[model samples]
Target: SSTLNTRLIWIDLEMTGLDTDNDQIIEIATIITDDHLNVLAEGPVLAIHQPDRILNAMDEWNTRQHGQSGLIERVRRSKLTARDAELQTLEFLKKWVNPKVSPMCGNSICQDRRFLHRLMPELEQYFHYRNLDVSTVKELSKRWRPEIMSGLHLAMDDIRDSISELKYYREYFFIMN
Candidate 1:
């Protein structure tokens, strides 16, 4: 098999909780960019509708965060289905992603990937199975130079920060002195 250099698909999902089995993703934000962090395209953060029961099941922290961020209300007011959300996201990626190599990229992106499997399988398969998880580096960089920020629990804001963070790490951590 041959490989070609391709853009990275960075995504962030705001869910009720981390449990892929029970928790449903309330929002999704994605940005496509190259290795150097130059953005090629992006889509508006999508709010996915969920039932009150699902929202009620959220752990205290998630509830507080999303509630404060108005994402819970956003989820409730959203008129789109999970498939609808998927289609919108796919449409955005389809135009720019070109169906080529798209490795998942984000902070704790594995978690988002898992949610995609449960909620948006088509989108999951669209991305390369491999991933570039920023949280992994943060874990290692904790003892040294680390670029960090407080999370706002809003998908688009979170993803923008993730991009900035990856940008910071690439500029500082991966350089040859």
Candidate 2:
């Protein structure tokens, strides 16, 4: 059956580290799309910094992968403050999806969900318990196209890559139904 009834908000988050409990979200990107993956709205790229936390420079290899050299500076100059970033994202979600629940699609999104829950607890009411895992979809087709996993560790790029791959598989591979 076609599950094209509700909207899917594509989400990606870049954090300081892999430890969800300790690390914090430095960058977040949300792409709201229809059931068929067509973009409906793109939320502003949110770069945030917790005033209480002191972040250290990433390892050379990690820095190269994440590409966040001026991250802290950017966050300092961001139009929206940390609290505002969370509120803006929540507002955007509320405006599009029902205030009750919405589906979120992403690669390994559980971590992102965790951050969202912690960052904006009020917004939890608007999202489903289980997200649409794009990582699983990519894994299911790894042999056919290993290149789908090439992009790594950036919020917006990762969101774009996930959507592009999802579209590719749906259009040509007949994997998504």
TM-score to native of every candidate shown: 0.88, 0.79
Q: At residue 41, what lDDT does model 1 achieve?
A: 72
Q: Please tell me which predicted candidate would have the highest lDDT against the true structure.
A: 1
lDDT tens string, model 1, 1-177?
Answer: 112356778899888887878778788889888766787778768899988988888889998999999988988899988899899999888766655477888988888888999889999998888888988877766667534433217788788888988777676667746
What digit string (tens of lDDT, one per residue) describes model 2 on residues 1-177?
213347777888877667767666777788878887778888878888645233445445544544555666665565665577778888787667665455668889888788777766665546777688877777776877666545436677789888987787776557454
TM-score of 2: 0.79
Look at candidate 2 and tell me the lDDT of residue 16: 64
lDDT of each: 0.81, 0.70
TM-score of 1: 0.88
User: What lDDT would candidate 2 get against the real structure?
Assistant: 0.70
